[PDB]
Amino acid sequence: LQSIIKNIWIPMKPYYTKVYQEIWIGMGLMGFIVYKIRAAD
Amino acid sequence: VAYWRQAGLSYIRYSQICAKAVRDALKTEFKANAEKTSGSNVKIV
Amino acid sequence: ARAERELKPARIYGLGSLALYEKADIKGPEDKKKHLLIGVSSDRGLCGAIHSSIAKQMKSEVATLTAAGKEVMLVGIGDKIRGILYRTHSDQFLVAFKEVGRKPPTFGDASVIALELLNSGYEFDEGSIIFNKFRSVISYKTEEKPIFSLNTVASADSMSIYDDIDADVLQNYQEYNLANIIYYSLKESTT
Amino acid sequence: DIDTAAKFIGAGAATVGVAGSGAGIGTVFGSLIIGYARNPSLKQQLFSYAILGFALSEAMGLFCLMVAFLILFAM
Amino acid sequence: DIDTAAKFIGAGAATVGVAGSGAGIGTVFGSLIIGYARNPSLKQQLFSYAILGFALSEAMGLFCLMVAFLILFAM
Amino acid sequence: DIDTAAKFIGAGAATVGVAGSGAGIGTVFGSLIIGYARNPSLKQQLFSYAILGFALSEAMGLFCLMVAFLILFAM
Amino acid sequence: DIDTAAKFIGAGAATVGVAGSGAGIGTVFGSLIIGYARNPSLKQQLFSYAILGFALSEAMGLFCLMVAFLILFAM
Amino acid sequence: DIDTAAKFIGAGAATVGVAGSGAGIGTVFGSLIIGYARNPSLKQQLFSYAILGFALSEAMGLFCLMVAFLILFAM
Amino acid sequence: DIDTAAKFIGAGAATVGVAGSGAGIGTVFGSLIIGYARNPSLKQQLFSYAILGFALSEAMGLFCLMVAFLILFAM
Amino acid sequence: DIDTAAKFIGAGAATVGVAGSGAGIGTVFGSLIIGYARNPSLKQQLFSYAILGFALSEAMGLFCLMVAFLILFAM
Amino acid sequence: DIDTAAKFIGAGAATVGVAGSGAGIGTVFGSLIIGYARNPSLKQQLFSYAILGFALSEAMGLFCLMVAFLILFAM
Amino acid sequence: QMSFTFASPTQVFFNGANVRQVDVPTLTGAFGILAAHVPTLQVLRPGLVVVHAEDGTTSKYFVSSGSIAVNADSSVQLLAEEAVTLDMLDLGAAKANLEKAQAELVGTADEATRAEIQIRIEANEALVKALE
Amino acid sequence: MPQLNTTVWPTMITPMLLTLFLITQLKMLNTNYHLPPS
Amino acid sequence: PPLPEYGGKVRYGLIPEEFFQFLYPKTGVTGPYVLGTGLILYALSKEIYVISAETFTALSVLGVMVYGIKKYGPFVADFADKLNEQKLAQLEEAK
Amino acid sequence: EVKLGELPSWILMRDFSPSGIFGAFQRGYYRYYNKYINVKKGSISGITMVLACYVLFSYSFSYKHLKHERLRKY
Amino acid sequence: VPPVQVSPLIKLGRYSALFLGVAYGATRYNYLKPRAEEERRIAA
Amino acid sequence: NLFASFIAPTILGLPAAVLIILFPPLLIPTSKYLINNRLITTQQWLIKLTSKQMMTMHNTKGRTWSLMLVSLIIFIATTNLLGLLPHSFTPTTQLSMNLAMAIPLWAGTVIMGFRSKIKNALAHFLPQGTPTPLIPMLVIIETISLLIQPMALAVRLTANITAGHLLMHLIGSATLAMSTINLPSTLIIFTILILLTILEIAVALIQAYVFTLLVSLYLHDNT
Amino acid sequence: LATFWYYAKVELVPPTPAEIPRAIQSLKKIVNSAQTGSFKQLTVKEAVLNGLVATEVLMWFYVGEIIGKRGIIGYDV
Amino acid sequence: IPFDQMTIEDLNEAFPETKLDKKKYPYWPHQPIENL
Numbered sequence A: 001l002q003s004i005i006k007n008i009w010i011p012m013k014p015y016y017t018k019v020y021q022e023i024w025i026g027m028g029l030m031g032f033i034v035y036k037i038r039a040a041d
Numbered sequence B: 001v002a003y004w005r006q007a008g009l010s011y012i013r014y015s016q017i018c019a020k021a022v023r024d025a026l027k028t029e030f031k032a033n034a035e036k037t038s039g040s041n042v043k044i045v
Numbered sequence C: 001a002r003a004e005r006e007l008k009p010a011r012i013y014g015l016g017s018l019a020l021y022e023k024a025d026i027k028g029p030e031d032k033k034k035h036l037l038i039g040v041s042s043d044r045g046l047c048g049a050i051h052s053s054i055a056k057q058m059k060s061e062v063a064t065l066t067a068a069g070k071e072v073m074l075v076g077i078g079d080k081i082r083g084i085l086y087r088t089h090s091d092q093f094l095v096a097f098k099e100v101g102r103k104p105p106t107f108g109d110a111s112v113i114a115l116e117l118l119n120s121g122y123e124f125d126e127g128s129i130i131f132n133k134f135r136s137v138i139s140y141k142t143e144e145k146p147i148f149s150l151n152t153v154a155s156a157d158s159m160s161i162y163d164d165i166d167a168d169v170l171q172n173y174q175e176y177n178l179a180n181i182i183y184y185s186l187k188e189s190t191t
Numbered sequence D, E, F, G, H, I, J, K: 001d002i003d004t005a006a007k008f009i010g011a012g013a014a015t016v017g018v019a020g021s022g023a024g025i026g027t028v029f030g031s032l033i034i035g036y037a038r039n040p041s042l043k044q045q046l047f048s049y050a051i052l053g054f055a056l057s058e059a060m061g062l063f064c065l066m067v068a069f070l071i072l073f074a075m
Numbered sequence L: 001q002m003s004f005t006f007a008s009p010t011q012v013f014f015n016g017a018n019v020r021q022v023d024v025p026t027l028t029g030a031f032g033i034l035a036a037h038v039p040t041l042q043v044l045r046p047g048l049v050v051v052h053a054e055d056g057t058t059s060k061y062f063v064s065s066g067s068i069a070v071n072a073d074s075s076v077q078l079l080a081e082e083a084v085t086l087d088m089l090d091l092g093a094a095k096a097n098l099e100k101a102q103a104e105l106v107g108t109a110d111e112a113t114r115a116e117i118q119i120r121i122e123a124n125e126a127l128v129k130a131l132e
Numbered sequence M: 001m002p003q004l005n006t007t008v009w010p011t012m013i014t015p016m017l018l019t020l021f022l023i024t025q026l027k028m029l030n031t032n033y034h035l036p037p038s
Numbered sequence N: 001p002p003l004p005e006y007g008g009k010v011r012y013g014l015i016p017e018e019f020f021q022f023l024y025p026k027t028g029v030t031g032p033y034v035l036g037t038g039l040i041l042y043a044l045s046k047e048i049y050v051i052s053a054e055t056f057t058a059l060s061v062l063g064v065m066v067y068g069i070k071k072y073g074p075f076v077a078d079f080a081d082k083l084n085e086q087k088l089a090q091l092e093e094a095k
Numbered sequence O: 001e002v003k004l005g006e007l008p009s010w011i012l013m014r015d016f017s018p019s020g021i022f023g024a025f026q027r028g029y030y031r032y033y034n035k036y037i038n039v040k041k042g043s044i045s046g047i048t049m050v051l052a053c054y055v056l057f058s059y060s061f062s063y064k065h066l067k068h069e070r071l072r073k074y
Numbered sequence P: 001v002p003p004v005q006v007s008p009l010i011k012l013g014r015y016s017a018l019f020l021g022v023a024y025g026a027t028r029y030n031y032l033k034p035r036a037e038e039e040r041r042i043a044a
Numbered sequence Q: 001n002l003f004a005s006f007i008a009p010t011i012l013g014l015p016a017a018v019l020i021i022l023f024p025p026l027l028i029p030t031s032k033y034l035i036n037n038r039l040i041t042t043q044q045w046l047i048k049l050t051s052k053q054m055m056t057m058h059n060t061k062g063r064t065w066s067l068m069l070v071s072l073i074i075f076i077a078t079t080n081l082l083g084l085l086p087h088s089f090t091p092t093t094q095l096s097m098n099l100a101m102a103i104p105l106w107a108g109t110v111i112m113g114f115r116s117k118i119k120n121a122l123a124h125f126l127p128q129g130t131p132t133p134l135i136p137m138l139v140i141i142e143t144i145s146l147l148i149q150p151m152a153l154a155v156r157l158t159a160n161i162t163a164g165h166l167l168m169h170l171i172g173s174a175t176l177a178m179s180t181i182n183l184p185s186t187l188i189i190f191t192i193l194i195l196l197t198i199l200e201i202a203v204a205l206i207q208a209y210v211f212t213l214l215v216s217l218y219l220h221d222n223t
Numbered sequence R: 001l002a003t004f005w006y007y008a009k010v011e012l013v014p015p016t017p018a019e020i021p022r023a024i025q026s027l028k029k030i031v032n033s034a035q036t037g038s039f040k041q042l043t044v045k046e047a048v049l050n051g052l053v054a055t056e057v058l059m060w061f062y063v064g065e066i067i068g069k070r071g072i073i074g075y076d077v
Numbered sequence S: 001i002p003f004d005q006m007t008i009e010d011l012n013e014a015f016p017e018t019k020l021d022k023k024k025y026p027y028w029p030h031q032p033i034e035n036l
């Protein structure tokens, strides 16, 4: 998985680690919402 | 912002043109005195 | 002689032209850098201390402003003041004018002077015009009247009461009032 | 029964009529803001008219409300 | 017995029409505020027009209420 | 007889349409007030224009009222 | 005979839609009054636009009336 | 029987929605009158913007006629 | 039952009166924008008026809202 | 079946609410005309704002359509 | 059997109340356009107020939408 | 209450007079000024100025340019660069110069000079509409 | 309304997350604007 | 490495000239054209391409695309060329 | 490459790994990009061909729905 | 570009297939018309 | 029958929706070179203009979302534009995808507003020049609006794009039904359809811009 | 206009009976490739070329079919 | 090297004035949006 570490994650590291952390909290919220919507159906 | 202000003119030029137009529409009895009492003589160096 | 007779309506005009700036009480900015200085006089000498006094005031306050850092550029209406001041203040000099005095000064002259004062690219942030206020046949006084730009008349919070005002109408009013004050001084200095 | 049901429906459809008073109050106070920003020397007098305007537009609204309470509680 | 139910429904639907007069009175008095803030020495004549506007706009509203009182009782 | 009921409900619905003429008369006379406070030398022509606008707006409103009375009486 | 009853109710509901044309004609002629007070030299051309405006909005209004009749008389 | 009935009722209610189109066209051409009285040299650009507003308006109307058709024919 | 049905219909109809408050808040804050563009040195006073208008216009809406609840749960 | 009948009625009643977006788009483009006639040097930025205004106002109306379809097809 | 039908009808009648927010957001952004064309040096501050107005106007409309679902899904 | 000061560069018509209404053709439209009118300051465009004296009688002048200023103390100062009473203008010369101006406009294509031509055209149009 | 069929929701969520957050942003990071020289 | 100065000479924006030249020898000039017409006829004849509302939305969006291309192709092409040559000129001046 | 080979073993001789077909797709994309897009004096056809193929694909899966709207039944 | 005379086998295929299609279409149309109207009538 | 172009597309049993969602980035090629072809030149110019438009109004912390907001507008615009092709399945007409685009961004916004600056973020709920006697009611609205701002985002996209398509499709059927009837009427309806297609292009771009602008404003009010 | 007809009068015309000899000759050539199996001798380029020509003659057959039933879209009834 | 064959890294090597400040501005576009 070389160039998957370097071309795919080395660029997105400063964002996926520092800037989009609250984005990931919100994405967990959204996943919970979607799971609850699909559960009541 | 009028059209002449977009065209680069200023209100002094607008006023000069409108006053010249008003004087040019004066009847010949007053026209000479009008352009003479308002004619310009200053010149730029 | 006749100039005193034509000074009455021109004085009423030019004084009603500046009643706003004393009713609105515009103080002008003492902080900005650029500065314009118009000196009104004639071309034909044998008049005594007219041009001498004009030059005194011009160079005096030019030094007074250069001591504060404000860039002052000179305009001379009349060949006498231009020839007197061209010896020492020539780089600080915008433009000068001719044929002032031979014929009685008319509004066309002031309009031309104001046009050339605008079509010169000098972004003057404040100005002053210096003329010879006529009091009686024996005495006159060297006076100066201020000239405000757009940014000081538009930002003055005393102009917040004036309705239907934007930057364009203020620009037009400032240009016409420049022409008006030049005409007032040109009618005052001939007498 | 059917009559009480329609009484509820009519009371609702009647009290819909307060939208006009809402929009009128909005317009009155909007023009009050504008006219006070234009001529702040007349504030008091201007405000007077504003009150009147409000007290009149809302007035019509009351009519709607009351006629609802004529179908809903009176008859 | 369904006709009386519809009388209630139609009376409510009729009286919803007063929202127009509400908004019209609001607009009239807002414009009075503005036109007085501009030129106050006309305070008399302006107000006259305002009244007229009101007295016409509100009139339309009354018509709505009228038809309400035509369906609710006169039938 | 459900047709009597439908006639009542349709008359109420049709007379809802007078709100437009109400707000239109309000706007017309408000703009008369504003345009007169600006240029009070044209009082006659501005008033004539206001009469025209009021006539057309109340014409649409009376179209609504006439449709209401046509459903309610003339089938 | 519920079909003719609902045709009545639908014609009423459809002709409700003339309020927009009323308010639009009001706004058109109000703005004509204002803009003629400002620049009374263009009295002709302004009025032309007014007619155009009054012709378009009212057009939409008439559509409602047409649709109303299409639910009342045609089918 | 009742289904076609409610279809007529819903079609009328849906075609109500072009009142906003009428009012929007009115406001658009009124502001065209005003803005042309202000700057009569931009007549062509102002007319272009007015045509754009009228288009977008009759569009938001088509959004209502769509649901009217869908209720009436393609349920 | 026919009472619960028409109570639902009546609440749903009554809660339309919030359109007036929506339009009134819109007008109040649009006029606040305009009055601030005119006289920005009154930014405090202007805003106060805005809130007042807001707190009044929406108020009417609230009335409508509670009426709906009044006929949904209370009686 | 009365359920589908009321589905049609409610769909129509829901899609009534696009008149607001019609009127709002009219207002936005009229104000674009005006503000462009007053400062035609900002033709771009003004238009930008117009876009935003449009896209928000229209948005509200589409919400209505949503409920319309949410009633008409997806129960 | 009929309570669900009336739930549909009441949901439609409730959600029609978004026209107010449509018109209000239109007014807010039209006034933003105008006020910016007048005093384009406050572009930020004006915009701020616009958002506020928007965030408030829309707010009212969403209330209606909420009630819609509270009648359509809760009871 | 109104202090009207109407003046040209060489002539004074009113000075501190108390007239009741003055109708001026500002570049942003025409408006009439009565006592306590909201303070404003505007620049004029070619057109009539109708002054209403307290007697209800009118005096009609034709101003070409200049500035009107209504102040907070109900003082009005109107300065016209060329204020000519209507008894001094003629219709034929105005219409002929309008002919000329429209001709050189349709002949000319550059922005600044055609702008000057448009200013002359609208001045002469105001002249024609003012006389008749 | 086919938008309400919640059985095909994940099929719409996971590829979007691969596009909005990984692929489009990666292609943006390759769009660089150098500073102007002397 | 430098970029070539021309593309692939696509005819009608859909079919490249390599196809026309490949089909030229055996069936002449009208070969590809008659193949295309026969394909469209067999498509809309055996209901392979069924006419629907999508047919007219397709015609509409294709007309708008073709008009937009024919009206703003020169403009955008020269705009991109001028952007590139402005950047090149600035970089040559800063050399 | 094919268009000159005339043997069936070729069809199985290729690299039918996930990486293999991925590299094949990448090479096809790069050939298309270098031919029609990655040239100066470029044209719009380099995009209209992609859009036409996208339309063909978007119609191919939409045939199961459009077949229920035929106006013939044969 | 001058025209190219087509191989005669291709021209033969073209026109023979055209005529075979004409025949096939006519015969199948006259074959399906009676069954078509039969089922149209039997449907009601 | 009518909503057929909004059902999840499947060919041969496989969910082609993933390919349709992953295709948009294929239209934005990139290059390391300094002078490149017309496509990349125009695209980099567009990205520069878009970033300058959306990001200039932020402080130094809001500008760290430049990649996110620019890639978001580039993704939504490209999706909506590819959705106008014939028979195309537009993944932005889906409430699922729009909710998954709306909830994470808004939630991260309010979370970064409540982790730092929480005092000022809570003061934002009460406007500055607010008189006191009725402030509790203003607490009810703002929060609930904040509680519906995410959904109000997604629907504002969905209910728009869907509707547009529906309208076009419906108007299309009109032409077809009037194809075998008076043809001048067909040409009028087709001119209406052309105006509607231009409006749909404009609305595609406008919906992209407004989605990303509302996310940008939520972010600005929390940084 | 006339360019289409100018090009068609050479290759888009009925085959003269004088060239049916070399027509059945080319048929004999292809059938000899069937006899021995010389389709193994065939590379992909001209193979897909011949396939496209066969598709073209099939489209001729289908055009004849649609002109043999006087209806474009399917069988009218 | 002619500028037609030049890479952004080659431009940063020849003109050190154009290299982006990946340390003062770590996130895209690695420069102030104004100067962009």
Ligand SMILES: COc1nc2ccc(Br)cc2cc1[C@@H](c1ccccc1)[C@@](O)(CCN(C)C)c1cccc2ccccc12
Binding pocket: G063, H018, H021, H054, H055, H056, H058, H059, H061, H062, H065, Q188, Q189, Q192, Q195, Q196, Q199
């Ligand atoms: C001519 O009017 C238009 N102008 C437009 C301008 C811009 C745009 Br983008 C759309 C426009 C659409 C139309 C009509 C139209 C004509 C033909 C087909 C479709 C739409 C219209 O939609 C009227 C608009 N109102 C009413 C919503 C309509 C719809 C349905 C039935 C009608 C019956 C009678 C008259 C008009 C009818």
